[PDB]
Write a protein that binds this ligand. Sequence first.
Ligand SMILES: c1ccc2[nH]ncc2c1
Length: 219
Amino acid sequence: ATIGRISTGSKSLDKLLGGGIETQAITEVFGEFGSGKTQLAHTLAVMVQLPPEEGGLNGSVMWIDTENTFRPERIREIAQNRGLDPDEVLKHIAYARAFNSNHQMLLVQQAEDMIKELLNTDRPVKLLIVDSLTSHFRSEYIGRGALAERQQKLAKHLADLHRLANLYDIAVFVTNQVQILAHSATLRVYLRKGKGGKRIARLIDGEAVFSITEKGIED
Ligand SMILES: c1ccc2[nH]ncc2c1
């Protein structure tokens, strides 16, 4: 299958990304607390539901939340302010809270069932969010010996996510709170606060600038 692209809501960020976030890929955003990672996730969960000529994929969403940071009313606000029905947009987000890293890993395997179910509907899953990818791993795997163990478990989790992205033509979008370790996302985006309330994004391994607004994010 040909890759699809999802607009982030920001023309600046879309250009940095080569045209939006890609299906058949894991895009990791990383940065300090407050850098806007979860706001971008909320915005993408709306944008993907737009038709293709508007920057979406007519897609549904699966969201794995490890920090209780998903806000249904933020989805509804972004949707309404972009001209979409807030309740229809929210309904197309399947939502699960991951209680620990082992549950998080099972939830990714479990997501395949709904992905298959929806694959030939008019709104197949096109975006899978894990927010936060790393928080449970960081809390659970700590101290001498934990680097190798945590990295190996994360590698398996990321392999599972890569398979879903690649097999079912889904964009996987993950967040990581930061600030030497290896990473296996296909693309890593460093996010930080800038002047005037702006957020600045840089590809890791130019910079885009955007604001967090009632439309989610925009230039
Ligand atoms: C991941 C995210 C949301 C979900 N809803 N049901 C299963 C599942 C897995």
